[PDB]
């Protein structure tokens, strides 16, 4: 059986271990390290997809689009802090008008 | 080779009856690659300051606590600790 079945994850472990030795980070990767990093990546992926699915259900759609990803990321307090210097293609901006311009 | 089928496997667990476009799949691929590069680079920086030759779950945990915000890093450390506990037991 695979190590992703042992750990109970969904992201692979051997590909992460291969990218850790291969990408010149240390004369040595440890061990529990690809399992730990795969769990962190799976949690972050599930959080992004959960907020994107909520933003997709809020507009009567069944397919997640980059506008839904843009609204999901920018309508959250901490994901906007993590992804503040990132430009998403075909994403647009948040609708807001300053209160000194409305009649 | 990419993470697309794994993004489908994660997406079918939190929202069953939904889909995703290829552009959003590419954005998720870029997100996974960017977070991988950030965590691996910070864990590579932490292992040089102490003159060690490796990288370990403690190194990955220290790179997670420095990079992620307050409420997100606690759940990330908890999920990673549960996953590394289930690997040996």
């Amino acid at each position: 059986k695979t190590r992703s079945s042992r750990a109970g994850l969904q992201f692979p472990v051997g590909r992460v271990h291969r990218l850790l030795r291969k990408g010149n980070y240390s004369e040595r990767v440890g061990a529990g390290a690809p399992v730990y990093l795969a769990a962190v990546l799976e949690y972050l992926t599930a959080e992004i997809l959960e907020l994107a699915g909520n933003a997709a259900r809020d507009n009567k759609k069944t397919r997640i689009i980059p506008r839904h990803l843009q609204l999901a990321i920018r309508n959250d307090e901490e994901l906007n802090k993590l992804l503040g210097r990132v430009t998403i293609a075909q994403g647009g901006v948040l609708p807001n008008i300053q209160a000194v311009l409305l009649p | 080779e990419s993470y697309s089928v794994y993004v489908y496997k994660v997406l079918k667990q939190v929202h069953p009856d939904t889909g995703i476009s290829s552009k959003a799949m590419g954005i998720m691929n870029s997100f996974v690659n960017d977070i991988f590069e950030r965590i691996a680079g910070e864990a590579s920086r932490l292992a040089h300051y102490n003159k060690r030759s490796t990288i370990t779950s403690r190194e990955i945990q220290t790179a997670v606590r420095l990079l992620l915000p307050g409420e997100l890093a606690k759940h990330a450390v908890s999920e990673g600790t549960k996953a590394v506990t289930k690997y040996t037991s």
């Binding site: 397919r63 980059p66 | 476009s21």
Partner: peptide, 18 residues
Amino acid sequence: AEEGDSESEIEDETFNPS
């Protein structure tokens, strides 16, 4: 009872695992 233009979605197709 009312729906938006499908062209909106056509410009960005779903990811194909194959």
